[PDB]
């Protein structure tokens, strides 16, 4: 009866710039692993990570967490950045 973990996190921007403010945990174990997609090719396995965007646009940024079962969940959300 291993609950799966919760995967959220909220996005702080800056022009292109983006930091991530990750709130995921799992109610019954703990997180072992994070797996970011940005939406723009670039990729990252940083618990709270910060990236730039190189041009202008909306891209849908995703998440996924591990839990210590091996049980996972994937969030997303859409993100707009504009150049300064
Ligand atoms: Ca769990
Ligand atoms: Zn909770
Ligand atoms: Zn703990
Ligand atoms: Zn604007």
Do not use: C, I
């Not at 797996?35 to 090719?41: M, S």
């Not at 990570?49 to 891209?59: I, M, V």
């Not at 849908?60 to 969940?73: C, E, I, M, Q, W």
């Amino acid at each position: 009866e291993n609950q799966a973990p919760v995967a959220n996190f909220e996005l702080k921007t800056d022009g292109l710039s983006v930091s991530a403010f990750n709130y995921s945990h799992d109610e019954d174990g703990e997180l072992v692993s994070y797996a970011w997609d940005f939406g723009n090719g670039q990729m990252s396995s940083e618990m709270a990570p910060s990236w730039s965007y190189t041009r202008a646009g909306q891209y849908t940024v995703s998440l996924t967490v591990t839990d210590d079962k091996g049980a996972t969940n994937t969030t997303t959300r859409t993100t707009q950045v504009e150049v300064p």
